[PDB]
Amino acid sequence: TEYKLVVVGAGGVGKSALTIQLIQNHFVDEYDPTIEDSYRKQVVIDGETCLLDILDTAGQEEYSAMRDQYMRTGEGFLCVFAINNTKSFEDIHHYREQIKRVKDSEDVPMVLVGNKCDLPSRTVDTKQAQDLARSYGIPFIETSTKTRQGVDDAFYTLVREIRKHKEK
Amino acid sequence: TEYKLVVVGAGGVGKSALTIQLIQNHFVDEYDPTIEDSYRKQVVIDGETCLLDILDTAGQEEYSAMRDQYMRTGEGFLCVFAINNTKSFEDIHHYREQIKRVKDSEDVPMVLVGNKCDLPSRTVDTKQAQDLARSYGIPFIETSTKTRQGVDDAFYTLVREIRKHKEK
Ligand SMILES: Nc1nc2c(ncn2[C@@H]2O[C@H](COP(=O)(O)OP(=O)(O)O)[C@@H](O)[C@H]2O)c(=O)[nH]1
Numbered sequence: 001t002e003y004k005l006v007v008v009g010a011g012g013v014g015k016s017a018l019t020i021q022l023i024q025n026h027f028v029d030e031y032d033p034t035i036e037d038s039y040r041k042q043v044v045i046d047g048e049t050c051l052l053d054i055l056d057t058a059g060q061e062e063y064s065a066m067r068d069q070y071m072r073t074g075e076g077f078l079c080v081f082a083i084n085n086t087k088s089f090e091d092i093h094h095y096r097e098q099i100k101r102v103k104d105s106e107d108v109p110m111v112l113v114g115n116k117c118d119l120p121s122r123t124v125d126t127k128q129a130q131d132l133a134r135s136y137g138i139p140f141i142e143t144s145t146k147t148r149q150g151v152d153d154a155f156y157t158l159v160r161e162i163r164k165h166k167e168k
Numbered sequence: 169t170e171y172k173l174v175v176v177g178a179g180g181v182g183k184s185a186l187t188i189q190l191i192q193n194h195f196v197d198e199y200d201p202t203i204e205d206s207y208r209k210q211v212v213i214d215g216e217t218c219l220l221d222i223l224d225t226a227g228q229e230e231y232s233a234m235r236d237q238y239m240r241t242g243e244g245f246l247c248v249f250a251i252n253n254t255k256s257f258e259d260i261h262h263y264r265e266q267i268k269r270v271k272d273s274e275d276v277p278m279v280l281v282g283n284k285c286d287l288p289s290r291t292v293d294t295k296q297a298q299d300l301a302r303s304y305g306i307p308f309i310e311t312s313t314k315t316r317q318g319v320d321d322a323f324y325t326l327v328r329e330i331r332k333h334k335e336k
């Protein structure tokens with residue numbers, strides 16, 4: 001019964017960087033003698049075993065058949081833009097709308113993430129993003145994989161959102 | 169109407185290299201005024217529009233929730249090992265068995281691919297792989313992304329296998 005987390009957003013916003021850094025600080029080896037080699041790696045976030053996937057829509061993924069499958073399988077979504085990329089922020093709404101459509105749900109656990117908050121070349125203000133998150137009813141947090149600001153908190157917040165959804 | 173191709177195999181066998189090289193030689197821009205920016209990139213193989221996905225089970229993908237979803241969505245599978253990696257050849261059968269189980273089908277279009285055939289350090293003989301492919305009833309081809317040997321033929325053969333399956 002793992003929690004299934006999906007990281008979504010425009011190309012180049014830092015989805016891989018965020019996910020790698022999370023794994024780096026939260027993976028453990030678990031003994032499980034029912035599997036071939038007797039040990040498996042898992043990620044534990046806020047007490048929950050989590051699966052992690054990245055949904056990219058550009059580049060090689062312009063050729064993928066899997067977008068809607070990622071949206072159906074994911075239980076909560078980190079919706080990532082970069083604070084120095086206005087287009088990436090503008091693209092968020094499309095992602096959120098597609099997820100809601102594919103999941104046929106108005107209550108999907110989500111956290112809005114403004115990554116690269118170490119950069120001095122900001123074009124998306126914290127207030128713009130907070131306003132967006134408030135409209136959606138979801139948390140917003142700024143992150144940087146360079147300084148580590150916010151990264152753990154973004155994923156832990158998403159886990160708490162999934163947990164509250166599952167307890168409904 | 170798109171043919172959905174999935175490249176599967178152990179980490180490091182060359183799945184990304186094969187897929188990138190295929191895209192490089194077969195992508196086209198298509199005019200489509202129904203979509204946002206009026207042009208979309210597509211891959212055309214043997215006259216068919218194809219979608220391309222890579223199923224990796226190790227590394228970051230040890231944490232993925234999506235393996236069975238890739239297997240359900242894919243219509244044909246390139247099962248890739250490397251000719252200098254005996255373990256990757258040994259791992260093929262497990263992949264094939266899982267695909268058949270998930271798809272609940274004895275007739276799944278597949279091609280067996282022995283990649284890195286430019287390398288002089290061979291530990292998997294062509295006969296070993298041909299014997300495996302014959303048992304499965306599927307084509308086998310050796311490829312190299314370094315010399316380009318076989319790469320186009322592997323994907324074109326898979327498209328023909330899917331086509332014949334769809335005409336049944
Ligand atoms: N300054 C800065 N660069 C970052 C940060 N996170 C990622 N990057 C860089 O942004 C680029 C894109 O990151 P990547 O993880 O590949 O993005 P993805 O395409 O969304 O997976 C890379 O060069 C990363 O080094 C961050 O918090 N700050």
Ligand SMILES: Nc1nc2c(ncn2[C@@H]2O[C@H](COP(=O)(O)OP(=O)(O)O)[C@@H](O)[C@H]2O)c(=O)[nH]1
Nearest residue numbers: 179180181182183184185283284285312313314
């Ligand atoms: N010599 C040789 N190396 C290859 C070939 N295809 C891929 N490689 C290398 O093998 C490594 C793994 O390739 P990659 O595509 O990342 O494998 P994947 O993990 O299966 O996606 C990389 O260093 C590639 O450069 C090939 O045909 N010949």
